[PDB]
């Protein structure tokens, strides 16, 4: 399973 994020990715 891919790791969970630390924090949300930014929008594009």
């Amino acid at each position, epitope marked *: *399973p*891919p*790791p*969970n*994020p*630390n*924090d*949300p*990715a*930014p929008p*594009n």
Partner: antibody
Amino acid sequence: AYLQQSGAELVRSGASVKMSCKASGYTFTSYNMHWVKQTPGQGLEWIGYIYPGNGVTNFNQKFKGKATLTADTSSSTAYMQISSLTSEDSAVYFCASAAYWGQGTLVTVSS
Amino acid sequence: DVVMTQTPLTLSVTIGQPASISCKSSQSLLYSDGKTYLNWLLQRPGQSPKRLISLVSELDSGVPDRFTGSGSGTDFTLKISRVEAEDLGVYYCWQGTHFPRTFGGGTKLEIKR
């Protein structure tokens, strides 16, 4: 998986330094790539991130215009450049993304 | 900035003892996607940090189930059911919901023997 940082640096006051963070074992473009300062004996301070999927950066206001963050998706390598170095910039610098941290790059500012 | 307050500053524990570390944020860590971005790290001297927990309670691969993370809003806890010798080091929480990202001051776990 892992993050491999470049080696230690001796740099003069007022010069700049560029360090690297090579990623493997997770999708480099799917997670924010963070840079974090630790003065030894002290805690962790966030510098900024780049999201390699689209190049967007976000910075701690303390480091805006001092730190430049880039990411080479062809080589899965992130870079941090710090300009106008002073004594307060001697520290270990980490990169961190997803479940991983790099091993740190020690920068010593000295003439 | 959102301040992360960690207590205690130091945990002095024997092998087998339960341990608990508190992390309180000055503002709610609930993000607009419904997730709470609270991470726990462990750092050993001359070594880098290692992530143990993300999204408040989700253990990373390979982390022993003696570790549990709990909380919501502003109040978070990392617990160790029974301390082992390899658990020593400095634990940090850090929040991913607000800018700038911020870290707790660390809790040093030391072993008595």
